[PDB]
Design a binder for this molecule. Structure first.
Ligand code: CLA
Ligand code: CLA
Ligand code: CLA
Ligand code: CLA
Ligand code: CLA
Ligand code: CLA
Ligand SMILES: CCCCCC(=O)OC\C(C=C=C1C(C)(C)C[C@H](OC(C)=O)C[C@@]1(C)O)=C/C=C/C(C)=C/C=C/C=C(C)/C=C/C=C(\C)C(=O)C[C@@]12O[C@]1(C)C[C@@H](O)CC2(C)C
Ligand SMILES: CCCCCC(=O)OC\C(C=C=C1C(C)(C)C[C@H](OC(C)=O)C[C@@]1(C)O)=C/C=C/C(C)=C/C=C/C=C(C)/C=C/C=C(\C)C(=O)C[C@@]12O[C@]1(C)C[C@@H](O)CC2(C)C
Ligand SMILES: CC1=C(C#C/C(C)=C/C=C/C(C)=C/C=C/C=C(C)/C=C/C=C(C)/C=C/[C@@]23O[C@]2(C)C[C@@H](O)CC3(C)C)C(C)(C)C[C@H](O)C1
Ligand SMILES: CC1=C(C#C/C(C)=C/C=C/C(C)=C/C=C/C=C(C)/C=C/C=C(C)/C=C/[C@@]23O[C@]2(C)C[C@@H](O)CC3(C)C)C(C)(C)C[C@H](O)C1
Ligand SMILES: CC1=C(/C=C/C(C)=C/C=C/C(C)=C/C=C/C=C(C)/C=C/C=C(C)/C=C/C2=C(C)CCCC2(C)C)C(C)(C)CCC1
Ligand code: SF4
Lengths: 30, 733, 176, 172, 33, 87, 80
């Protein structure tokens, strides 16, 4: 069983990955 | 400027809707954008590589997280043959009550999708036993994706952009790839197997907290250092092992028994670690080849320039191939896609032939889906390799650099090659269609004894030479007291012979005349797809109908209706034509595999052996018979869990059908229709105040061919996948 | 021609002096393959500097809990020896503050390092400036050389401590 | 600021992003949501009307019944959700309606965003219905929401009951 | 309690996110020099 | 860069195709080719005359000597190259 | 706008100019053939790309060549 704190930690890591993905996409830019 | 195709001034000034379509469609064509240099192109490709790698690892982390969170891995470990693996939970506000009760399956109480990708068996073999392990793997891959995204951002920075000389360093890159990325990774996987996966198979629990103090072997680095490497092979797992527990287990970490584990019907885990160790050593030695910074090693230019046969047999040899490959990214990419397509077709053959994951070859649905998956991907990569070779010929091939080269001679005798591919394809098609129609008419007229049934003696001879002993050929491995049968008789032979001579494995399936006919059909498909692709690649630079085809580029609509008519004359149109043939031959391969395994799994191989020799047998015994659980997913009396597969079956039918729109009807009809609609909108009250910014026009000719082809392919995939999943699920055999 | 560290090897062409600690020690030629990419040695010097600073703080932190004692506050029931095994008994209601403080500090330092600006002396974060006023370039160079020497010594030291306490019971001359 | 103005010119033109308008609106929303949190505390205190033990059947709510893990959505969550949906409908009518009596959600045609800055926003001498004092109140409300969320997450208690520690006998 | 996350994230992501992306993409398409 | 290794206009490759062994005379190449072939065939014959076993009979000296059979191919090719070059 | 080029294999037989529906081509004096004229394309911005000139050329592998390029409101033939 995966606890709620673990899921929220994974969500925080995914949010940081999203911000870095936006940074990379805007570094290639349009 | 501020317009959307900032990379194409030509597209930004287009006043029509063609600008948006062509800006989306040409976004990744980094060679043709405005003001692009080579160095900037290589740097952008490096950053895109990093982003794509991060996407891959994010996808894998998502699979791990969903199986950990909404899966039944705990229940599936305790009973793998009877518990259905779970992909993820379903959230749908469109469901009715009976759909909620119908999709509530497995041990869970919520609507749910049953996983058909085989990720449960793969993780179960490599030591995963709890949901916490899957969650920690998901976290690790999330952090890895984050790191890769930051690296991709970092290497576009002004002080971290690598130069053009760094990218064209072939010797250093190949040395590091061949040593590190292959051998060191294989060595690390062998280490993981021996430290975690093999002890988990024997009941031991090895994790990050106790792996550094638990010896994988009872001695530990003493047989390795002393040289008594055979001590690691003694006491293997007996043939009563029971996977995951300790009864009948052994203390061996590197063996080569060969064959299958008797309970899991998969290869021994100690064979796999030994295999990985051998591949690791071989790849490190192979990466110790090219000269980088220390004098020893080869120069790739000298090897290519030296390989000229003595008296003009291959022209100037391979002189100038080093300069063409390094300066053309289309040739490198084409070689990479060709090799990867061969590789994924090889994994498709070997994962059903020699399963390595425990308790597969009994699910049958993952077994069908993985094979069809990898075969379709193999066809795609194979078509793409030839497409990029055509692109390389169009805009990367230098005739003066390749004077009398081994590559220019290919263009010198291209007519012979295309004509002989034409002869082979016509011969194969004529003969296999004639044999199939003959068998059709003979069976239809009540006389099945008049069929032309050729026994496939060459492949049966190969099976006998590998050890199969029912054909009675009595050669090599099938015959004892032979040099091949004696030399390996005490390393890997007994396991191989007890695995190849049983009727429960997919090792070297018994083949008859239907196998002969369908193999000839497969050869027909391969030769015709090769015909179209090779003809497009070789005539990409010009032909008699258009001697200046290189001036117009790789993809262009036509050359007008003059001099007879020039429909579909570019090499892109050759790709577009060969896509259909690839889909056809992959469908043939997957139909053959699926029907043969459907008859073998049910213990009714005689049905295939009797009905595969004529086309109506296929039509009425595979397609018509096995569609009954699929099309009955929902009906007038209710629905069950295969209603989604029935809906997707009709969905793929409709997409495949609406491809025929764009493939058969061409621009003019639609342009006049659009003009009438433009008048309608401009001349109606109330609604003429709403004005478009981009003038609506019909789709361009190449765009229409692409859209129809994409429709054809998506409908093809989405009508074959529900059948190959639901028919196997609807029979359980 | 030849390096001042390895006398029988050629001098690294990237290490042409004019930098603290440049004794020409680069047998692999890492700095050779950095500048032919068009880069410089600012980032790798910054990495070495904070690697060494964390190494010094680490050398004090391995020895301090057992040689002297623990914090007077509660929850300090973590093992005095085995700091590498004392990582896992830290309560999360202190790891949160530790992670937040390091996160904001490294965010500010990331804004400093990755910016673009050419006036940034490598390592000059501005945290330490209370003792370098009124000094010649020789004094500042000597002070930075002492910092770099302590950096490399502390990194070798912490590698020794971690490889000793994991295999052997503890450090020999000071513990047990 | 100018970093985000250069990074997102289309987004910073209309006042979106880290601007004073956004932070004032978020402070106002935090104030009203603090009032809503207190009102829901009173709702669990008195038991005015909603009961959170019964379920939402399919036959009266469609696919917005059983949704998560085949788990029932309760009448209390449904009632609070309906109230929030009505607040959001009033919100959409105010955001996309005539700009009467109100500071706009976005910036109009070529108008500069205001700047009461921040720091400490002097409370003395700015009493009454002043933008600086309302600004301070919304800033404190947002920090109170952050502190309550963190305290509830750490303590493992209910968000509505982690503030019941700091009241004593109040409402519920 | 992790039984709320599907019903929260799936509508938010699947409906709200691509609608805003379609509007933003259309606006970025039709802006000119 | 590299060296001009192309020999398409000559009947034999130049001596520089041998790399580090570009100065070894042809007689040494041929004698070592014969010796390496004989030793390698003997070593691989010690794997079929005696049944190679799982660890008991592996004899890594015979494994290292088994690599002389592909090495013997390169030595007799290099013997021909040096002979046509006059070395 | 498409780009139209005329090569020196012209014979000045004028069929491309007559076949042009957009008044793109015209005849200019020349001395490289018996007719004393070569085709020219001074109004390539009015080119639509229908390649009626290339159908009308009698020379082996046509001397007047139209390369499809950028699309405008004239080269698309849009009345709206
Ligand atoms: C030892 C050092 C080393 C290592 C490990 C790598 C590693 C890598 N480099 Mg690299 N590189 C190096 C040195 C190294 N490089 C040097 C020195 C140079 C300069 C000369 C370069 C220049 C360079 C460039 C220019 C690029 C890379 C790229 C890459 C990446 C390849 C993409 C990928 O993931 O394929 C991983 C592939 C494998 C692990 C093997 C695939 C092949 C096998 C047959 C697959 C099947 C194996 C197995 C059956 C799989 C089943 C697993 C499971 C599902 C059962 C990879 C991360 C590319 C990239 O992505 O950039 C970010 C790229 O563009 N490198
Ligand atoms: C079922 C549909 C179908 C069939 C039968 C064919 C058949 C063929 N295609 Mg084809 N094609 C199709 C659909 C089909 N295509 C579609 C949908 C596309 C996508 C646009 C293409 C795209 C395509 C391309 C791009 C190419 C082909 C080529 C070929 C030829 C391959 C050589 C061959 O098999 O010769 C066998 C001949 C036949 C099967 C035709 C039937 C002839 C008779 C009726 C057979 C009778 C049997 C027996 C001999 C009777 C005795 C005769 C009697 C007088 C004694 C062949 C004519 C290739 C080609 O022409 O290369 C040479 C090629 O380049 N096709
Ligand atoms: C449930 C809580 C909540 C609510 C009701 C709002 C409501 C609002 N936020 Mg907001 N926000 C929140 C949490 C919340 N936020 C959080 C947690 C953050 C992260 C710190 C932000 C960060 C944020 C920014 C950066 C901006 C808003 C903006 C807005 C406004 C317009 C949003 C929009 O375009 O719709 C969709 C709106 C008043 C925007 C605004 O007011 O611009 C004028 C704006 O620029 N918000
Ligand atoms: C690429 C991998 C991938 C894919 C295809 C999915 C797919 C799905 N997830 Mg999901 N997820 C993933 C990774 C992935 N997940 C990861 C890594 C996490 C850990 C943070 C989660 C955590 C998660 C939760 C907590 C929930 C889902 C849910 C869902 C479902 C509804 C969609 C939704 O609301 O997603 C929302 C997903 C997120 C907010 C997390 C971001 C997902 C990854 C990190 C983004 C990857 C982008 C990918 C590379 C594509 C890029 C191109 C794209 C921009 C077009 C859907 C089946 C919901 C569900 O179970 O419904 C039944 C749900 O409640 N996901
Ligand atoms: C995958 C995402 C997704 C989700 C989560 C939903 C969700 C829903 N759909 Mg829907 N739909 C989708 C995609 C989706 N749709 C697509 C792609 C199509 C086209 C094929 C449709 C076509 C469709 C039809 C034809 C109908 C629905 C209906 C419904 C509702 C189910 C009936 C019910 O119990 O509520 C009952 C409904 C309510 C209680 C009203 C809720 C109030 C609204 C929906 C909330 C406001 C949302 C807000 C405006 C979003 C702004 C987006 C913008 C920022 C871009 C539910 C709200 C039914 C419906 O809406 O009932 C009238 C219905 O008749 N859907
Ligand atoms: C099977 C193909 C093949 C062939 C024909 C050669 C042939 C050669 N190698 Mg070689 N090599 C091979 C495979 C091969 N190798 C492999 C698989 C590796 C990886 C272990 C190497 C690694 C290697 C190195 C590191 C060096 C050679 C060198 C040489 C040359 C000197 C031999 C000599 O004179 O010995 C007496 C010779 C031309 C040497 C040379 O001259 O470099 C150009 C050298 O330094 N090779
Ligand atoms: C809060 C401020 C910072 C406090 C932290 C601190 O410490 O300050 C930082 C600082 C300077 C400063 C500043 C202040 C003036 C202090 C404050 C300023 O701020 C303002 C605004 O003014 C900032 C700054 C930077 O200017 C100076 C600190 C320097 C420090 C801490 C230097 C330790 C080296 C250790 C070594 C070399 C270990 C060797 C160990 C060796 C060589 C061994 O062989 C050990 C070993 O043999 C053993 C024993 C047994 C064996 O079995 C194992 C081995 C073999 C491994
Ligand atoms: C002491 C012996 C005396 C007689 C022998 C000898 O000296 O003659 C030398 C000679 C002629 C000569 C002479 C001159 C040099 C011209 C002049 C001499 O006078 C002088 C000194 O000037 C006289 C003379 C007559 O001698 C000609 C030599 C010809 C020679 C030596 C031809 C080798 C082929 C190798 C092949 C095809 C390898 C295949 C290898 C294979 C197929 C494999 O590797 C398989 C493999 O599984 C293996 C086995 C191991 C695995 O790991 C790797 C794999 C799996 C791949
Ligand atoms: C330079 C060069 C070369 C080189 C080199 C070499 C040798 C490079 C080596 C670099 C090296 C060795 C870099 C170490 C970093 C380690 C750090 C920063 C550790 C921090 C440690 C921390 C932050 C730990 C903190 C702890 O709190 C924890 C975790 C638990 C507590 O209970 C205990 C303490 C407080 C301790 C070549 C390759 C030889 C040739 C080339 O050509 C040129
Ligand atoms: C300075 C700087 C840095 C920084 C920083 C920092 C520390 C940034 C911190 C930002 C921070 C801390 C931002 C909090 C926002 C809180 C909000 C928006 C709360 C909204 C809450 C609202 C709008 C109310 C919502 C509800 O009322 C609703 C609608 C209904 C109620 O039923 C429920 C509630 C009451 C909840 C770095 C990282 C170092 C990098 C760089 O150097 C720049
Ligand atoms: C267009 C082009 C291109 C491409 C091409 C291609 C795509 C190709 C392909 C190719 C291919 C795809 C090939 C294949 C091959 C294969 C092979 C070559 C195989 C082999 C095998 C073998 C050799 C084996 C043998 C054996 C063994 C060992 C085991 C046992 C049995 C036997 C004996 C069988 C490029 C880019 C280059 C450029 C130019 C143009
Ligand atoms: S393409 Fe058409 S309009 Fe243009 S020159 Fe040729 S015939 Fe005239």
């Amino acid at each position: 069983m995966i606890t709620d704190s673990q899921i929220f930690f994974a969500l925080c890591i995914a949010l940081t990955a999203a911000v870095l993905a936006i940074g990379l996409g805007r570094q290639l830019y349009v | 400027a501020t317009k959307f195709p900032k990379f194409s001034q030509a597209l930004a000034q287009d006043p029509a809707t063609r600008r948006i379509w062509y800006g989306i469609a040409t976004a990744h064509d980094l060679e043709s954008h405005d003001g692009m240099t080579e160095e900037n192109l290589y740097q952008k490709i490096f950053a895109s590589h990093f982003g794509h790698l991060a996407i891959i690892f994010l996808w894998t982390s998502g699979n791990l997280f969903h199986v950990a969170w909404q899966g039944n891995f705990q229940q599936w470990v305790l009973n793998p043959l009877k518990v259905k693996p779970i992909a993820h939970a379903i959230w749908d506000p469109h469901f009715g009550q009976s759909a909620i009760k119908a999709f509530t399956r497995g041990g869970v109480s919520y609507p749910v999708n049953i996983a058909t990708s085989g990720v449960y068996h793969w993780w179960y073999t490599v030591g995963m036993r709890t949901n916490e392990d899957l969650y920690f793997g998901a976290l690790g891959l999330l952090v890895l994706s984050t790191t890769l995204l930051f690296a991709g951002w970092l290497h576009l920075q002004p002080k971290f952009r690598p130069g053009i000389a760094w990218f064209k360093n072939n010797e250093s890159r190949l040395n590091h790839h061949l040593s590190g990325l292959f051998g060191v990774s294989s060595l690390a996987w062998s280490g993981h197997l021996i430290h975690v996966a093999i002890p988990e198979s024997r009941g031991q629990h090895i994790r990050w907290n106790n792996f550094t103090s638990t010896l994988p072997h009872p001695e530990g680095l003493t047989p390795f250092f002393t040289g008594n490497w055979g001590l690691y092979a003694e006491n293997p797992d007996t043939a009563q092992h029971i996977f995951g527990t300790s009864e009948g287990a052994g203390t061996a970490i590197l063996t080569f028994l060969g064959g299958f584990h008797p309970q899991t019907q998969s290869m021994w885990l100690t064979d796999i670690a030994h295999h990985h160790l051998a591949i690791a050593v071989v790849f490190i030695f192979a990466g110790h080849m090219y000269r980088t910074n220390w004098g020893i090693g080869h120069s790739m230019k000298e090897i290519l320039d030296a390989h000229v046969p003595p008296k003009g047999r291959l022209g100037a040899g391979h002189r100038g191939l080093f300069e063409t490959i390094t300066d053309s990214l289309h040739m490198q990419l084409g070689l990479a896609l060709a090799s990867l397509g061969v590789a994924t077709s090889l994994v498709a053959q070997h994962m059903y032939a020699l399963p390595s994951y425990a308790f597969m070859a009994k699910d049958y649905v993952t077994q069908a889906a993985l094979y069809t998956h990898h075969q379709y991907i193999a066809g795609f990569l194979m078509v793409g390799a030839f497409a990029h070779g055509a692109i390389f010929f169009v805009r990367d091939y230098d005739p003066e650099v390749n004077k009398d080269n081994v590559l220019a001679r290919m263009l010198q005798h291209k007519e012979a090659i295309i004509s002989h591919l034409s002869w082979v394809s016509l011969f194969l098609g004529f003969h296999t269609l004639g044999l199939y129609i003959h068998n059709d008419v003979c069976v239809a007229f009540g006389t099945p004894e008049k069929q032309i049934l050729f026994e496939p003696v060459f492949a049966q001879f190969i099976q006998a030479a590998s050890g199969k002993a029912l054909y009675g050929f009595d050669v090599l491995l099938s015959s004892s007291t032979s040099a091949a049968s004696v030399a390996s008789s005490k390393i890997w032979l007994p396991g191989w012979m007890e695995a190849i001579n049983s009727g429960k494995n997919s090792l070297f399936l018994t083949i008859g005349p239907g196998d002969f006919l369908v193999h000839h059909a497969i050869a027909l498909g391969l030769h015709t797809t090769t015909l179209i692709l090779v003809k497009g690649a070789l005539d990409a630079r010009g032909s008699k109908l258009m001697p200046d085809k290189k001036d117009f580029g790789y993809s262009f609509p036509c050359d007008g209706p003059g001099r007879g008519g020039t429909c579909d004359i570019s090499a892109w149109d050759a790709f577009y034509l060969a896509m259909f043939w690839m889909l056809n031959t992959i469908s043939w391969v997957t139909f053959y595999w699926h029907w043969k395994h459907l008859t073998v799994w049910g213990g009714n191989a005689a049905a295939f052996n009797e009905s595969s020799t004529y086309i109506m047998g296929w039509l009425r015994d595979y397609l018509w018979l096995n569609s009954s659980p699929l099309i009955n997913g929902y009906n007038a009396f209710g629905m069950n869990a295969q209603a989604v597969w029935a809906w997707m079956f009709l969905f793929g039918h409709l997409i495949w059908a609406t491809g025929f729109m764009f493939l058969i009807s061409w621009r003019g009809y639609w342009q006049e229709l659009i003009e009438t609609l433009v008048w309608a909108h401009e001349r109606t009250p109330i609604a003429n105040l709403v004005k478009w910014r981009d003038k609506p026009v019909a789709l361009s000719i190449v765009q229409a061919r692409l859209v129809g082809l994409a429709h054809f392919t998506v409908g093809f995939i989405f009508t074959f996948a529900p059948f190959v999943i639901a028919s196997t699920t609807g029979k359980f055999a | 021609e030849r390096s001042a560290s390895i006398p029988f090897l050629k001098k690294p062409p990237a290490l042409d002096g004019s930098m603290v600690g440049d004794v020409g020690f680069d047998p692999l030629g890492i700095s050779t393959t950095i500048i032919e990419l068009g880069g410089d040695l600012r980032y790798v010097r910054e990495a070495e500097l904070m690697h060494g600073r964390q190494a010094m703080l680490a050398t004090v932190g391995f020895v301090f809990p057992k040689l002297f004692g623990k914090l007077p506050v509660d929850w300090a029931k973590d093992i005095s020896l085995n700091p590498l095994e004392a990582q896992y008994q830290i309560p999360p209601v202190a790891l949160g503050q530790i992670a937040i403080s390091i996160a904001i500090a490294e965010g500010l330092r990331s804004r400093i390092v990755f910016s673009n600006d050419p006036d940034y002396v490598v390592g000059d974060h501005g945290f330490g400036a209370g003792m370098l006023k009124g000094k010649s370039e020789a004094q500042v160079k000597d002070m930075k050389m002492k910092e770099l020497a302590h950096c490399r010594l502390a990194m070798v030291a912490i590698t020794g401590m971690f490889f000793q306490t994991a295999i052997t019971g503890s450090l020999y001359p000071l513990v047990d | 600021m100018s970093q985000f103005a250069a990074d997102y010119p289309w987004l910073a033109k209309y006042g979106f992003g880290p601007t004073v308008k956004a932070e004032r609106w978020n402070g106002r929303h935090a104030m009203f949501g603090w009032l809503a949190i207190l009102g829901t505390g009173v709702a669990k205190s008195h038991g005015w009307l909603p009961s959170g033990d019964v379920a939402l059947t399919y036959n009266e709510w469609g696919g917005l019944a059983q949704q998560g893990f085949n788990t029932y959505i309760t009448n209390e969550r449904a009632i609070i959700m309906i109230a929030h949906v009505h607040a959001l409908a009033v919100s959409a009518a105010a955001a996309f309606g005539p700009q009467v009596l109100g500071d706009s959600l976005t910036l109009l045609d070529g108008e500069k965003d205001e700047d009461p800055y921040g720091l400490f926003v002097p409370l003395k001498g700015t009493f009454g219905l002043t933008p600086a004092a309302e600004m301070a109140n919304g800033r404190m409300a947002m920090m109170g929401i952050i502190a309550v969320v963190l305290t509830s997450a750490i303590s493992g208690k209910d968000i509505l009951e982690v503030v019941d520690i700091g009241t004593g006998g109040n409402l519920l | 309690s992790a039984s709320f996350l599907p019903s929260i994230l799936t509508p938010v992501v699947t409906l709200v996110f691509p609608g805003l992306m379609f509007a933003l993409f259309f606006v970025l398409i039709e802006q000119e020099e | 860069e590299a060296a001009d290794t192309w020999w398409g206009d000559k009947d034999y490759p130049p001596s520089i195709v041998l790399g580090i062994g570009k100065d070894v005379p042809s007689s040494i190449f041929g004698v070592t080719s014969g010796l390496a072939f004989a030793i390698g065939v003997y070593c691989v014959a010690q794997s079929n005359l005696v049944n190679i076993l799982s660890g008991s009979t592996v004899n890594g000296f015979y494994v290292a000597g088994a690599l002389l059979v592909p090495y013997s191919w390169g030595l007799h090719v290099a013997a021909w190259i040096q002979k046509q070059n006059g070395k | 706008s498409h780009s139209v080029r005329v090569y020196d294999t012209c014979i000045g037989c004028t069929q491309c100019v007559r076949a042009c529906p957009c008044d793109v081509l015209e005849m200019v004096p020349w001395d490289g053939c018996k007719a004393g004229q070569i085709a020219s394309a001074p109004r390539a911005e009015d080119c639509i790309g229908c390649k009626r000139c290339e159908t009308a050329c009698p020379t082996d592998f046509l001397s007047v060549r139209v390369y499809l390029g950028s699309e405008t409101t004239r080269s698309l033939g849009l009345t709206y």
